[PDB]
Amino acid sequence: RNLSALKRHRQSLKRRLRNKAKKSAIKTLSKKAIQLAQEGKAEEALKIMRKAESLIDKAAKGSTLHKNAAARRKSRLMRKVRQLLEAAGAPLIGGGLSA
Amino acid sequence: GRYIGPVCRLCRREGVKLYLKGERCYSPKCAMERRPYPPGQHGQKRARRPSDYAVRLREKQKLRRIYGISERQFRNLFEEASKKKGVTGSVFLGLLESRLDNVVYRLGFAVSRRQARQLVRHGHITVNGRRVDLPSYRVRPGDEIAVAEKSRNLELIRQNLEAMKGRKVGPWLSLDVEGMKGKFLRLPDREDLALPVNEQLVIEFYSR
Amino acid sequence: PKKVLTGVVVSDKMQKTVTVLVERQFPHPLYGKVIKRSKKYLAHDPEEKYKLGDVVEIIESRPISKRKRFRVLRLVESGRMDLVEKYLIRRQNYESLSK
Amino acid sequence: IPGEGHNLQEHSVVLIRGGRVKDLPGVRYHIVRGVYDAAGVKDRKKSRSKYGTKKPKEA
Amino acid sequence: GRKERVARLLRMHANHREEVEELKAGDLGAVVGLKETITGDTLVGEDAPRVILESIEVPEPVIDVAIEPKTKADQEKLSQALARLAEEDPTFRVSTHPETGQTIISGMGELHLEIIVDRLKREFKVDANVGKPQVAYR
Amino acid sequence: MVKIRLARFGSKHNPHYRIVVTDARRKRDGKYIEKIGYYDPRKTTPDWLKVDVERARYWLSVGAQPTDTARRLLRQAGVFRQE
RNA sequence: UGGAGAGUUUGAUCCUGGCUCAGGGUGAACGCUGGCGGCGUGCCUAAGACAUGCAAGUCGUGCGGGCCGCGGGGUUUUACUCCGUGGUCAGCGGCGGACGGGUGAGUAACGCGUGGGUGACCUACCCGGAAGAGGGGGACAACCCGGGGAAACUCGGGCUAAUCCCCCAUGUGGACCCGCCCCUUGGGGUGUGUCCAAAGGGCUUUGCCCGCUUCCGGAUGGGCCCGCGUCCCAUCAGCUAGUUGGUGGGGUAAUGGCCCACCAAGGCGACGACGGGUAGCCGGUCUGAGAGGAUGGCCGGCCACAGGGGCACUGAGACACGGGCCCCACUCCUACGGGAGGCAGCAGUUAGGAAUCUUCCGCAAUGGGCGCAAGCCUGACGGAGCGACGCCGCUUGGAGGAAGAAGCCCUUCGGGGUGUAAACUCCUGAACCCGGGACGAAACCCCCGACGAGGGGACUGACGGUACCGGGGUAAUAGCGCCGGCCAACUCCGUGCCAGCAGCCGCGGUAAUACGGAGGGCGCGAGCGUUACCCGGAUUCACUGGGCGUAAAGGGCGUGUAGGCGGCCUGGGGCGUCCCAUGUGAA
Ligand SMILES: [Mg+2]
Ligand SMILES: [Mg+2]
Ligand SMILES: [Mg+2]
Ligand SMILES: [Mg+2]
Ligand SMILES: [Mg+2]
Ligand SMILES: [Mg+2]
Ligand SMILES: [Mg+2]
Ligand SMILES: [Mg+2]
Ligand SMILES: [Mg+2]
Ligand SMILES: [Mg+2]
Ligand SMILES: [Mg+2]
Ligand SMILES: [Mg+2]
Ligand SMILES: [Mg+2]
Ligand SMILES: [Mg+2]
Ligand SMILES: [Mg+2]
Ligand SMILES: [Mg+2]
Ligand SMILES: [Mg+2]
Ligand SMILES: [Mg+2]
Ligand SMILES: [Mg+2]
Ligand SMILES: [Mg+2]
Ligand SMILES: [Mg+2]
Ligand SMILES: [Mg+2]
Ligand SMILES: [Mg+2]
Ligand SMILES: [Mg+2]
Ligand SMILES: [Mg+2]
Ligand SMILES: [Mg+2]
Ligand SMILES: [Mg+2]
Ligand SMILES: [Mg+2]
Ligand SMILES: [Mg+2]
Ligand SMILES: [Mg+2]
Ligand SMILES: [Mg+2]
Ligand SMILES: [Mg+2]
Ligand SMILES: [Mg+2]
Ligand SMILES: [Mg+2]
Ligand SMILES: [Mg+2]
Ligand SMILES: [Mg+2]
Ligand SMILES: [Mg+2]
Ligand SMILES: [Mg+2]
Ligand SMILES: [Mg+2]
Ligand SMILES: [Mg+2]
Ligand SMILES: [Mg+2]
Ligand SMILES: [Mg+2]
Ligand SMILES: [Mg+2]
Ligand SMILES: [Mg+2]
Ligand SMILES: [Mg+2]
Ligand SMILES: [Mg+2]
Ligand SMILES: [Mg+2]
Ligand SMILES: [Mg+2]
Ligand SMILES: [Mg+2]
Ligand SMILES: [Mg+2]
Ligand SMILES: [Mg+2]
Ligand SMILES: [Mg+2]
Ligand SMILES: [Mg+2]
Ligand SMILES: [Mg+2]
Ligand SMILES: [Mg+2]
Ligand SMILES: [Mg+2]
Ligand SMILES: [Mg+2]
Ligand SMILES: [Mg+2]
Ligand SMILES: [Mg+2]
Ligand SMILES: [Mg+2]
Ligand SMILES: [Mg+2]
Ligand SMILES: [Mg+2]
Ligand SMILES: [Mg+2]
Ligand SMILES: [Mg+2]
Ligand SMILES: [Mg+2]
Ligand SMILES: [Mg+2]
Ligand SMILES: [Mg+2]
Ligand SMILES: [Mg+2]
Ligand SMILES: [Mg+2]
Ligand SMILES: [Mg+2]
Ligand SMILES: [Mg+2]
Ligand SMILES: [Mg+2]
Ligand SMILES: [Mg+2]
Ligand SMILES: [Mg+2]
Ligand SMILES: [Mg+2]
Ligand SMILES: [Mg+2]
Ligand SMILES: [Mg+2]
Ligand SMILES: [Mg+2]
Ligand SMILES: [Mg+2]
Ligand SMILES: [Mg+2]
Ligand SMILES: [Mg+2]
Ligand SMILES: [Mg+2]
Ligand SMILES: [Mg+2]
Ligand SMILES: [Zn+2]
């Protein structure tokens, strides 16, 4: 009575579980960086932003995020981090912002 | 199927003299010599002035009953001529005279049209060497309508092919009696066929 | 090519957006009489340089919002308040067609 | 109910055909003879097909 | 005189149903298809001598009762049923009194008409009353 | 991917194909990209197979994959022959 | 290369005007009759409910095992248990289940059609190009044991393999912020900073074959946007709060109020918004002189749906017909504690209806998924079956044959008709019987050659022992409508406003060409009629192509808004219009 598209559903869940866990991280660190960036903490802000960037791009290589999506987040993150920082900041140990 | 039934009975109705019997239709008795009036309990009673419709109907029947054709093939043949480039009047007849069965008769091999039909139909006829048994076959300029082997020695054939000695075939054709062969040279024309029919009228019939 | 239309501005009540009223004629599909119809387009005016009364070229564009799919290309002439008086009257009139 | 004589009762199943009868009011249809419970006309000879009667054999 | 279609043959076993590919002479079975064939009818190859075998019989009913639905709305529901029923049992019959318009249902016995009506309710979802047929006086 | 295959036409008991380039996903006789030639498996005509080697080659150079019998026919029209 | 009209208001007339008919057409149905073949075509109703089988699967050349076969080894037809081969069963992993096929429910909408736009984008597998494929770890099934259970199968612990997962490195390259140059809606270049790659598998062994990673480009397929076009009711006239716009965010591949905050108040409507009714749209099809009208079954395109409703997951692609979750309706199984299902796929059942089929054959071909390949799968498809459902073709015989059998019908009792029709004489020879017997099939593959080109070799047919051919060979089916006028075709009898006919006008009251029968005739013919519907006739919504004094029809009269239309002369522009070229106008 049963087809084997069930294996596909099995695949489904595990993969879902997988990249689900990756997107959380990305959102967390991103938030974490911008939170610090506004708080004036240049160094740790940038430090976390770098980690985020890595996690985003790492998501891009597989079927989780992908391409412009990752490209996009990074820009929004960097765009946000830099702006908030020039609230008397100066980028310490310039993390991931060519400047 | 075709008509398959009293023929002469039609010759009296059309008032004219049809040749749906071959030989007899020359003897002193195509019934057009004896009872030149319409068949039926009446026939020889006063004839009322034909209605405009009765004229065209009777004229159109006149032509169709001459070739044995069904009202379906007749009308179809007609509409094709209409479409065709040129005076549908002539063209129509032309297509009718191009019919295979007809040509066989117009060629001699057969005493009448019905007989020609059966000849063609029984594989006795041959077009360009290959046998054809479809009376409706359209013969084209250049084809060679002939007989076949098991067909030549045949009794009825020799008869019909002997009567052709001397006799000349219409301008648009060219029989070869001693070869039982024959070519369809040219598409005929209004003047070539001495038909007791005013085709102009058939055209008009098919309007309504 | 990007469609380009010419109309007059009849509304500048919105921010960075003007309402351009474009006319057009054409043969009646059945009665052949040339008829005049008209359509209103919301054209993007980011510099807020176009005002009520201008006849302008409108050009097809990347969506700026729901309804705004054109950008003001350039000024054709100015002050045609006459062309607005009409539309306004045509509109004012509606207040007299109900029950 | 077309034809001379019929076999229709207070429960017969009929096949309606459409087509009114000029001298009859709310009569906008004709029962089809020879279908369901409407027998064909008995002894009919001429326009047979219109009265659901089969060709009689010369016995 | 009707062309029938034997879609598939089938043998009735004590527990399941075997679908055989054929049934030869002297054997019994059930066929699926055939929308017209009824009890007693003869079946011959689509060519074979169109003969008409013996058999059938069919005794005449012994008792009659008049039946009428619960609501005029159930009328065709009931009629359609009775008809279907007279098709499976040539011993059961539906008639319409020529004089008094009622429908007379008839069968082989009190018990017979009893399972009929009851069969009409449970299996045909039609509830009908039954009573002694009216009399045509003069 | 895009392909070069036989699209059926003709008629019942009268197969008449059309050598065409289409996406591998269209139905067998659906809309196609371009017609490059025709083919008549029963040689009812001396001219029972034509191909536009020119175009056929063009599409081959751009990814189009020939089905087997489509390959057979093109080979025969001399498309793969570099002389 | 294309246009026919007639009957009916009156004592009679002309006009007006409605009704009616002759034609063509259909996925048809019903009645009568029925021989063949080919090609088409067949649930139009309950988008009702469905027993049963079959409609996607495929890879051991990604990986570890289980059960079996055969063989050789301690020793066995006691191999069990122990290398090694071909299989098999699931599991893990991959690729495809988003194609193909079905349906017309919903939708008047950028849904579709047509032409455009994207500096606002995506595209697995396929081509072309460049550069790589170096290290290090880890888990979960399978499996064994344990626990729950009748079962589906569930739960726990424990190992374990990879092309599964993860970190590190190299960075040809790429992504992002920024500055600069070019360019102009987010495109191209460039610099410092940060950030990102990978699988090994099989052989005739470094040499090949299939895979892996990044980037650039091509092809193909798409998303989104825009102009114009797209039914009836105004006895639906006002509609609008995410409503219209802005700012900033979220979101996606990408624009957008698409979503959310905050600000502003807008946006739409008689050029018909809003509301209600109906409807999938197109290529086309039918009709028509045309202009129009009607239509959208079959076939091709888009779309939409998958018991009703809502939602995400996985993924290059789906908010997914034979995947998932929840709610509703419904149905099935049960050891009564929870299990199962979704034919608008093929075929078939049941229901409804006036009505439309085989639960068939085959993967031989063409096309599709997977695989290096062999090959497997494919109710796509190729065919066969039943149905005059349609169209085309064929047959029921041909030539003789009487002033003309019989019968039957008329009859002025002379005779006339059926009718050369029959009989009858010849001749030909549908069916049938005998022999033979296809095309559609050449390649994948294999061999020389480089796995190239080229040359060469072999396998393969459902339809079918069929089409077709040769040979022999019996004359051997005919029906249905009409016969007052339109309208082609008349007499006798029966009947007596009874029975009936009827599309209209009207026939029937005891000589009825109008009813029923008969003879005879006209029309067609494997058929003919009927009903329903569409266009025609209807110049009868008159754009082509009508009208309003008395036939239907001038608003009771002004004033006037929008709108429609507008004199002479000359210049500018060149939107209308006209012209040419070119693109497009799929099949
Ligand atoms: Mg699988
Ligand atoms: Mg958190
Ligand atoms: Mg905006
Ligand atoms: Mg009628
Ligand atoms: Mg009659
Ligand atoms: Mg009158
Ligand atoms: Mg009139
Ligand atoms: Mg009067
Ligand atoms: Mg009068
Ligand atoms: Mg079929
Ligand atoms: Mg349907
Ligand atoms: Mg199968
Ligand atoms: Mg199968
Ligand atoms: Mg599927
Ligand atoms: Mg599809
Ligand atoms: Mg629909
Ligand atoms: Mg609908
Ligand atoms: Mg609506
Ligand atoms: Mg559009
Ligand atoms: Mg388009
Ligand atoms: Mg994929
Ligand atoms: Mg490449
Ligand atoms: Mg175990
Ligand atoms: Mg565990
Ligand atoms: Mg991988
Ligand atoms: Mg490297
Ligand atoms: Mg680099
Ligand atoms: Mg750099
Ligand atoms: Mg790295
Ligand atoms: Mg590695
Ligand atoms: Mg529109
Ligand atoms: Mg934004
Ligand atoms: Mg954006
Ligand atoms: Mg909104
Ligand atoms: Mg509306
Ligand atoms: Mg509605
Ligand atoms: Mg007209
Ligand atoms: Mg149309
Ligand atoms: Mg359909
Ligand atoms: Mg279609
Ligand atoms: Mg739905
Ligand atoms: Mg359903
Ligand atoms: Mg559901
Ligand atoms: Mg649903
Ligand atoms: Mg995804
Ligand atoms: Mg699916
Ligand atoms: Mg779903
Ligand atoms: Mg969907
Ligand atoms: Mg299904
Ligand atoms: Mg089905
Ligand atoms: Mg029924
Ligand atoms: Mg079929
Ligand atoms: Mg099979
Ligand atoms: Mg196949
Ligand atoms: Mg294949
Ligand atoms: Mg098929
Ligand atoms: Mg004779
Ligand atoms: Mg003989
Ligand atoms: Mg062959
Ligand atoms: Mg060959
Ligand atoms: Mg070699
Ligand atoms: Mg080679
Ligand atoms: Mg070769
Ligand atoms: Mg093969
Ligand atoms: Mg007359
Ligand atoms: Mg009459
Ligand atoms: Mg025919
Ligand atoms: Mg008209
Ligand atoms: Mg006019
Ligand atoms: Mg008038
Ligand atoms: Mg008056
Ligand atoms: Mg008046
Ligand atoms: Mg007045
Ligand atoms: Mg008034
Ligand atoms: Mg004015
Ligand atoms: Mg002027
Ligand atoms: Mg003016
Ligand atoms: Mg001027
Ligand atoms: Mg111009
Ligand atoms: Mg042009
Ligand atoms: Mg042009
Ligand atoms: Mg052109
Ligand atoms: Mg075309
Ligand atoms: Zn004669």
Swiss-Prot record, chain A:
Residues 1-25 are annotated as: Disordered. GO terms for molecular function: small ribosomal subunit rRNA binding; structural constituent of ribosome. Gene3D superfamilies: Ribosomal protein S20 (1.20.58.110). Belongs to the bacterial ribosomal protein bS20 family. Keywords: Ribonucleoprotein, Ribosomal protein, RNA-binding, rRNA-binding. One of its GO terms (cellular component) is small ribosomal subunit. The lineage of its organism: Bacteria, Thermotogati, Deinococcota, Deinococci, Thermales. Part of the 30S ribosomal subunit. PANTHER family: 30S RIBOSOMAL PROTEIN S20, SMALL RIBOSOMAL SUBUNIT PROTEIN BS20C. It comes from Thermus thermophilus (strain ATCC 27634 / DSM 579 / HB8). HAMAP family: Ribosomal_bS20 (MF_00500). Pfam families: Ribosomal_S20p. This is Small ribosomal subunit protein bS20. One of its GO terms (biological process) is translation. SUPFAM superfamilies: Ribosomal protein S20. One of the primary rRNA binding proteins, it binds directly to 16S rRNA where it nucleates assembly of the bottom of the body of the 30S subunit, by binding to several RNA helices of the 16S rRNA.
UniProtKB/Swiss-Prot annotation, chain C:
Part of the 30S ribosomal subunit. Contacts protein S12. PANTHER family: 40S RIBOSOMAL PROTEIN S11 FAMILY MEMBER, SMALL RIBOSOMAL SUBUNIT PROTEIN US17M. This is Small ribosomal subunit protein uS17. One of its GO terms (biological process) is translation. Coiled coil: none annotated. GO terms for molecular function: rRNA binding; structural constituent of ribosome. Transmembrane segments: none annotated. Disruption phenotype: Increased generation time and a temperature-sensitive phenotype. HAMAP family: Ribosomal_uS17_B. Belongs to the universal ribosomal protein uS17 family. Disulfide bonds: none annotated. One of the primary rRNA binding proteins, it binds directly to 16S rRNA where it helps nucleate assembly of the platform and body of the 30S subunit by bringing together and stabilizing interactions between several different RNA helices. The combined cluster of proteins S8, S12 and S17 appears to hold together the shoulder and platform of the 30S subunit. The keyword Ribosomal protein applies. InterPro entries: NA-bd_OB-fold, Ribosomal_uS17, Ribosomal_uS17_bact/chlr, Ribosomal_uS17_CS. The lineage of its organism: Bacteria, Thermotogati, Deinococcota, Deinococci, Thermales. It comes from Thermus thermophilus (strain ATCC 27634 / DSM 579 / HB8). Keywords: Ribonucleoprotein, Ribosomal protein, RNA-binding, rRNA-binding. GO terms for cellular component: cytosolic small ribosomal subunit.
Swiss-Prot record, chain D:
The modification 3-methylthioaspartic acid is found at residue 23. The methythiolated Asp-23 contacts a modifed residue of the 16S rRNA close to the decoding center, and might be important for decoding center assembly. Residues 43-54 have a biased composition (Basic residues). It comes from the Bacteria. Residues 40-59 are annotated as: Disordered. Part of the 30S ribosomal subunit. Contacts proteins S8 and S17. Interacts with IF1 in the 30S initiation complex. Belongs to the universal ribosomal protein uS12 family. With S4 and S5 plays an important role in translational accuracy. Interacts with and stabilizes bases of the 16S rRNA that are involved in tRNA selection in the A site and with the mRNA backbone. Located at the interface of the 30S and 50S subunits, it traverses the body of the 30S subunit contacting proteins on the other side and probably holding the rRNA structure together. The combined cluster of proteins S8, S12 and S17 appears to hold together the shoulder and platform of the 30S subunit. This is Small ribosomal subunit protein uS12. The chain holds residues 67 to 125 of 132 of the full protein.
UniProtKB/Swiss-Prot annotation, chain E:
It is found in: Cytoplasm. Catalyzes the GTP-dependent ribosomal translocation step during translation elongation. During this step, the ribosome changes from the pre-translocational (PRE) to the post-translocational (POST) state as the newly formed A-site-bound peptidyl-tRNA and P-site-bound deacylated tRNA move to the P and E sites, respectively. Catalyzes the coordinated movement of the two tRNA molecules, the mRNA and conformational changes in the ribosome. It comes from Thermus thermophilus (strain ATCC 27634 / DSM 579 / HB8). It comes from the Bacteria. This is Elongation factor G. Belongs to the TRAFAC class translation factor GTPase superfamily. Classic translation factor GTPase family. EF-G/EF-2 subfamily. The chain holds residues 347 to 484 of 691 of the full protein.
